[PDB]
Design a protein around this nucleic acid. Structure first.
Ligand SMILES: Nc1nc2c(ncn2[C@@H]2O[C@H](COP(=O)(O)OP(=O)(O)OP(=O)(O)O)[C@@H](O)[C@H]2O)c(=O)[nH]1
Ligand SMILES: [Mg+2]
Lengths: 326, 1000
DNA sequence: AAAGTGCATACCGAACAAAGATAAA
DNA sequence: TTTATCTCCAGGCGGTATGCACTTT
């Protein structure tokens, strides 16, 4: 099922949240799955430059009617944001698209990482694919590929309550703290821009527009306060020790450290490196009996950089690409 | 019912205590378990019986009486085994005749038979002799009559093989008896050592200071690891014994079965033979458990004394095969082995799966904990800290995670720098140096001392073996004789071909022909990361390929000037495979190129023509023309053949363009010598001549259905030119593609001249087996992603097209075929609902059962590094897998029929004095004899299908699976679906005797 | 009255990697 | 709505927290 905005009060509240900043409001907002076009029409009433990315062809002519008279403000492109740059290879089918082709049809140039935010994507996360979408975005962000190739593009998406709670867990240990939270809080600044009851969003199924008392019955079953979350990639994410070449080792370290939640850091470090664990834990400042759950994401990054900064030993990691795909 | 895990582990402990010969521990454990009320229920009669037998063997009567009191108090009634043990001990202690009278009178009061005591499976010959001596006191004479040797099989198919009233021309070897005996001694010593060392064939490394330093460091580390492992083993033994003295189960007797030195040597061998990428914990565990069971079986035989009995029986048996010696009555090797008097080889009790996994895990943990290495190898004494050699790392795949032992990165570099010139192989993986032991029973055969199973299955399956052992003894004679015949084919290695392969492999490699290339000649921000990723991947595949090639070539070069034999076994369906995995004729083209027969034969009047036909078949250029055209083409290209034979690497290089390289070369090498001889009809050929069959599964469907058009389509009728269904399907697909391409679709333009027979062959073959579109797409994609002249970016769009068109080409190609397949599929499904796996009997007589069962619900072993999860194959309590039994019924049936045909042909070829070996459907021989084999093949086929196979299968399935009226409605449904068999057509199979291309 | 020992189930990670075709489940 | 997908040459996730039974301190 897909959620589309249904009411004009929502269409104006979300539009105002999207374009809240009154100093330099100009941004080429990239809006995905417009649906009927209520949100797009409201944004145009507020004044913006929308590049709509609808997945289905049926809606495409309809939007063309709304923006036909407008000259250049609105551009409808048949593409899906979550299928950009397939890794299988071969010919790129029209449902998918390559990032270079999109950023050539939109005229966007390349912006350095340390510079200002070029664009702003808005939309909603997949209804049942939050985890896979978040992992794909994390791989794209930490490797400077696809969208984040061009710059630190801001993304503002609607997400569910459970995934948000699992995404904002801290060393306070609500027993939801996991690797996704660590990477996302190390590479972004997550904020709750706005909150909406889920029944306020129209639901269209793949079969057709959802109706009948089953829609009312479905309202009680999946009632959860959807959060519009704002993500900007952190400026100082990449350092000398942490580079787009070395992100795989960091990912493996984080995944290993959560294999045994109730274990200490020193055991995992013994299992992962041939270096003196006590000396490393002395350098990072933590105590010997330090649990992995009681470690901050900044502590994980500092530990990885400290290990990578060891000049004395030629061999530092047992991680190897043979450990993948097996 | 079925025993629980603890009820298996306790029985294994008690049984192993008898072999280790520590009876006090078993007695203490039994007393402790019986005393406590909670553990009292676990103990069963067999646990008392094992301890009673152990006590009886020693000769203690008080302990046996105490255990009998225990068993009578706990419950149950004593069985025959308890009385047998009582009589054995009483005879051991020279008991008075009055006590023997009383004991046997009581035994008669319960009511049994003394013969069953001497037919007991557990009792050995010594125990039987002792109890016979004991019983001779009350009865002055006691005897058991002998019997005629087991009756020869009396069946329609196998009658002619086992009939004495006929002419026999059984072949013989070409070696003196003394040489055969010496080879037997060499093989026996090799198997006793359990290892072989082979000189490496890779390029030698010039000596230097660094190499010597690395070797010295390696030697020092080896000594230190040996000492540490010895100390750790001793401590583990003591710790495990202390648990036994606390009334708890452990693995003390299992760990006490072998000497410390042998276990240490095995652990060092495993450490030295660890891949640089590491191995999973469960795999390392099954390997260590299996190697320990093999070493214990070999050492038990050596200590007991069966080794000497085998030496005598074998040395006397070798008279049959040797050319010099002569036998009073020629017969099959199994028949001679039985007639010469058979030493009794007692089967070794297989350990239970939990015990095997626990022992493997314990040994792996001991290995990982005991070994340590200095951190700084290049710089001595920089830090006194010691790092482990192996590390335990998690590897994540999807949700799941796995545990892996990985070597330290410096150890791999040290091994690479040292460049040891000796490889180590296990005695089981190397071809034998003496003729194989005749397969006389499911328990014994193949290797001299190592245990080899008849039907290769998973580490815990037992249903196949019990079905084999529950059948009448005379049923398996044909299969055993066929296996013995196949294993008795002497082999040899080609010399000049090996020299050429070594020249290519050592210097730079020739990946075009198939020889890999050394890692030295390897290819060399996001873009840099992608380049390094591609380089590392390519290096990985080339390294693995070169490692495999190095192993195979070293093994081949070891046997340069020797004669060796390859034993065989079968899978559960019935198809036969060689036992030595590394080097055999079932491998790649180079493997088929190095091997040749050792017993040559004169070419005769019709040898050169068959050699030329074989050369043309290997070339692959002409596969549709008749035999005359192939012979004419071979005549045309004589100059190229002679040039290739004389100048393989520096010349016109015609042979490299063949479809099967390295075999066209060998055939040209033989043909040139045959031509240049003064008399080509008096030339000795050691080169096998292949003979293949076209559409074998389609042939068997045609025979069973007796469909006229289907039979004619697959060369099953007399014809002048070959017939190929695959070519017709390819032509139809090409016509459809031509129309589509003219209409305008791009993918049709992309693949225009790449629709050959190869791409559609496997799909068209597997359609009749019920393959789905997903599998067909994968097969076509795999075929397409190797052309190297096709734009790869369309592969996903290419195959997804072709499959549909391919499936289109098959609305109505087969009718009776699909009717038979649907009948078999529906019968299999309806049987699978009731919870009973499908079984059948092949026309030879062997029983086949298809073991597909739903997964065991949890199966983990607690421990100190990780909890290993293992499947419980071996649980007959699980429910059947209806999806995997429905899909597999036709292919297994047809493969069983193919195996039956192969075995019949092999037996009838052996009767005439032929050197017959086979690879599934390819029949090898000498050049001169090929025509003869052809004749018998056709005959056997007709006979194999003369019987109503389908009717017999239907009646057997009704009898076995519809006898129970438990589910009356579903029983009626099964009866209805099994009593409706597709009707045959109108095809006389005698025409098969005249068809030229039935096998070609 | 507490506490140890061992066995059964159940829910966690849902590591990304486009896509389509058929039926048992 | 959810999953596996012709057969063979021998394959399997590892951790945490929960109750339940009975024996032991
Ligand atoms: N189920 C199944 N059987 C196979 C497969 N490959 C081979 N076989 C069996 O092996 C038999 C002979 O194998 P091949 O010699 O490769 O096939 P073929 O039809 O004889 O080939 P041609 O000699 O070119 O006619 C086939 O008839 C099948 O019974 C496969 O992938 N699946
Ligand atoms: Mg064939």
């Amino acid at each position: 099922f897909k959620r589309y905005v249904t009411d004009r009060r929502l269409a104006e509240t979300l539009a105002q949240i999207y374009l809240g900043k009154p100093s330099r409001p100009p941004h080429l907002l990239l809006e995905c799955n417009p649906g009927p076009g209520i949100l797009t029409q409201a944004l145009l009433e507020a004044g913006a430059k929308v590049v709509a990315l609808e997945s289905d062809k049926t809606f495409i002519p309809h939007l063309e009617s709304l923006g036909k008279n407008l000259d250049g403000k609105l551009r409808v492109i048949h593409c899906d944001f979550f299928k950009l740059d397939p890794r299988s290879g071969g010919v790129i089918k029209p449902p998918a698209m390559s990032s270079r082709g999109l950023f050539k049809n939109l005229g966007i140039e390349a912006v350095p990482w340390t510079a200002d935010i070029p664009l702003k994507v808005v939309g909603m996360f997949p209804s049942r694919g939050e985890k896979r979408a978040l992992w794909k975005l994390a791989y794209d962000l930490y490797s400077c590929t696809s969208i984040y190739k061009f710059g630190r593009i801001e993304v503002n998406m609607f997400i569910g309550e459970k995934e948000f709670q699992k995404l904002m867990a801290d060393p306070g240990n609500p027993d939801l703290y996991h690797v996704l939270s660590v990477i996302w809080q190390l590479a972004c600044e997550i904020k709750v821009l706005h909150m909406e009851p889920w029944s306020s969003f129209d639901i269209y199924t793949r079969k057709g527009p959802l109706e009948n008392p089953k829609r009312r019955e479905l309202l009680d079953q999946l009632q959860q306060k959807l959060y519009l979350i704002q993500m900007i990639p952190r400026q100082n994410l990449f350092t000398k020790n942490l580079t787009p070449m070395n992100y795989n080792i960091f990912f493996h370290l984080l995944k290993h450290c959560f294999g045994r939640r109730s274990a200490t850091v020193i055991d995992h470090l013994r299992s992962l490196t041939p270096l003196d664990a006590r000396d490393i834990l002395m350098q990072i400042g933590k105590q010997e009996d330090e649990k992995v759950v009681n470690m901050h994401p900044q502590d994980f990054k500092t530990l990885f950089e400290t290990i990578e900064r060891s000049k004395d030993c030629a061999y530092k990691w047992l991680y190897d690409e043979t450990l993948e795909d097996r | 019912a079925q025993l629980s895990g603890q009820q298996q582990r306790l029985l294994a402990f008690f049984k192993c205590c008898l072999l280790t010969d520590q009876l006090p521990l078993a007695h203490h454990l039994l007393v402790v378990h019986h005393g406590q009320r909670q553990k009292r229920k676990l103990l069963t009669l067999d646990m008392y019986n094992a301890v009673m037998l152990g006590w009886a063997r020693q000769g203690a009567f008080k302990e046996l009486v105490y255990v009998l009191f225990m068993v009578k108090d706990a419950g149950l009634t004593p069985d025959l085994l308890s009385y047998a043990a009582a009589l054995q001990c009483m005879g051991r202690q020279d008991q008075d005749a009055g006590t023997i009278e009383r004991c046997l009178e009581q035994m008669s009061q319960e009511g049994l038979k003394l013969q069953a005591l001497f037919t007991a499976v557990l009792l050995s010959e010594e125990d039987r002799a002792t109890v016979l001596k004991a019983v001779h006191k009350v009865k002055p004479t006691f005897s058991l009559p002998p019997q005629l040797p087991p009756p020869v099989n009396t069946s329609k198919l196998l009658r002619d093989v086992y009939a004495k009233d006929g002419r026999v021309s059984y072949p013989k070897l070409h070696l003196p008896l003394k040489t055969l005996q010496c080879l037997f001694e060499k093989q026996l010593h090799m198997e006793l050592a359990s290892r072989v060392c082979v000189v490496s064939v890779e390029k030698p490394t010039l000596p230097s200071k660094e190499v010597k330093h690395a070797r010295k460091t390696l030697k020092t580390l080896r000594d230190q690891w040996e000492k540490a492992l010895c100390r750790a083993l001793r401590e583990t033994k003591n710790r495990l014994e202390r648990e036994v003295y606390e009334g708890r189960f452990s693995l003390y007797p299992f760990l006490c079965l072998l000497d410390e030195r042998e276990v240490v040597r095995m652990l060092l061998q495993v450490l030295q033979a660890l891949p640089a990428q590491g191995e999973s914990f469960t795999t390392l565990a099954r390997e260590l458990s299996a190697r320990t069971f093999s070493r214990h079986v070999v050492q038990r035989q050596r200590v007991s004394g069966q080794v000497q009995a085998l030496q005598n029986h074998y040395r006397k048996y070798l008279c049959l095969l040797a050319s010099d010696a002569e036998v009073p009555e020629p017969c099959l090797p199994r028949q001679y082995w039985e007639e010469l008097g058979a030493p009794e080889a007692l089967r070794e009790q297989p350990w239970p799966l939990p015990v095997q996994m626990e022992l493997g895990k314990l040994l792996a943990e001991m290995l990982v904990q005991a070994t340590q290495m200095p951190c700084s190898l290049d710089k001595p004494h920089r830090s006194s800290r010691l790092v482990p050699v192996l590390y335990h790392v998690y590897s994540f795949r999807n949700v799941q995670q796995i545990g892996i032992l990985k070597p330290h990165p410096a150890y791999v570099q040290l091994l690479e720098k040292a460049a040891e010139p000796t490889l180590t192989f296990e005695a089981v993986d190397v071809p034998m140096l003496c003729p194989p032991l005749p397969w006389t029973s499911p328990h014994s055969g193949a290797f001299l001392l190592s245990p080899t199973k008849l039907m290769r299955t998973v580490e815990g399956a037992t249903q196949h073996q019990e079905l084999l052992e529950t059948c009448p003894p005379t049923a398996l004679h044909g299969a055993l004789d066929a296996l013995t015949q196949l294993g008795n084919c002497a082999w040899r290695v080609n010399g000049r071909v090996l020299d050429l392969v070594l020249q290519l492999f050592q210097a730079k490699g020739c990946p075009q022909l198939g020889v890999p290339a050394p890692p030295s000649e390897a290819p060399q921000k996001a873009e840099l990361r992608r380049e390094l990723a591609h380089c590392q991947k390519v290096a990985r595949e080339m390294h693995s390929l070169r490692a495999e090639a190095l192993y195979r070539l070293s093994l081949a070069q070891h046997l340069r000037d020797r004669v060796f034999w390859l034993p065989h076994n079968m899978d559960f369906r019935g198809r036969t495979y060689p036992c030595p995995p590394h080097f055999n004729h079932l491998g790649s083209d180079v493997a088929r190129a190095l091997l040749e027969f050792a017993q040559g034969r004169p070419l005769g009047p019709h040898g050169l023509d068959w050699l030329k036909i074989h050369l043309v078949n290997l070339t692959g250029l002409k596969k549709r023309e008749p035999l005359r055209k192939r012979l004419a083409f071979a005549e045309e290209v004589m100059d190229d053949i002679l040039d290739s034979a004389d100048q393989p690497l520096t010349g016109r290089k015609w042979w490299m363009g063949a479809e099967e390289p390295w075999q066209t070369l060998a055939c040209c090498m033989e043909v040139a010598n045959a031509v240049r001889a003064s008399d080509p009809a008096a030339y000795v050929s050691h080169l096998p001549v292949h003979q293949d069959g076209s559409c074998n599964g389609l042939q068997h469907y045609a025979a069973l259905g007796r469909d006229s058009v289907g039979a004619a389509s697959v060369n099953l009728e007399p014809s002048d030119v070959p017939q190929d269904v695959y070519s017709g399907v390819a032509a139809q697909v090409e016509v459809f593609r031509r129309q589509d391409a003219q209409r305008g679709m791009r993918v049709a333009q992309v693949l225009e001249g790449f629709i050959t027979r190869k791409v559609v062959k496997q799909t068209v073959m597997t359609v009749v087996y019920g393959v789905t579109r997903y599998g067909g797409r994968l097969q076509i994609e795999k075929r397409l992603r190797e052309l190297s002249d096709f734009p790869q970016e369309f592969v996903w769009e290419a195959s997804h097209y072709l499959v549909r068109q391919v499936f289109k080409s098959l609305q109505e190609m087969f009718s009776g075929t699909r009717a038979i397949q649907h009948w078999l599929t529906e019968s299999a499904r309806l049987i699978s609902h009731m919870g009973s796996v499908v079984e059948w009997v092949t026309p030879l007589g062997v029983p086949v059962i298809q073991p597909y069962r739903l997964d065991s619900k949890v199966k983990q072993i607690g421990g100190g590094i990780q909890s290993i999860t293992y499947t419980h194959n071996g649980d007959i309590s699980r429910k059947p897998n209806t999806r995997k039994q429905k899909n597999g019924f036709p292919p297994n049936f047809i493969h069983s029929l193919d195996s039956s045909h192969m075995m019949l042909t092999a037996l009838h070829c052996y009767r005439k004095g032929l050197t017959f070996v086979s690879v599934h459907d390819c029949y090898w021989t000498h050049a001169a004899d090929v025509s003869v084999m052809n004749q018998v093949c056709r005959e056997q086929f007709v006979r194999l299908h003369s019987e109503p196979i389908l009717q017999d299968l239907s009646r057997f399935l009704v009898k076995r699976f519809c006898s129970e009226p438990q589910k009356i409605l579903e029983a009626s449904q099964l009866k209805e679906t099994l009593q409706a068999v597709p009707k045959p057509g109108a095809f006389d199979l005698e025409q098969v005797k005249r068809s030229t291309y039935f096998f070609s």
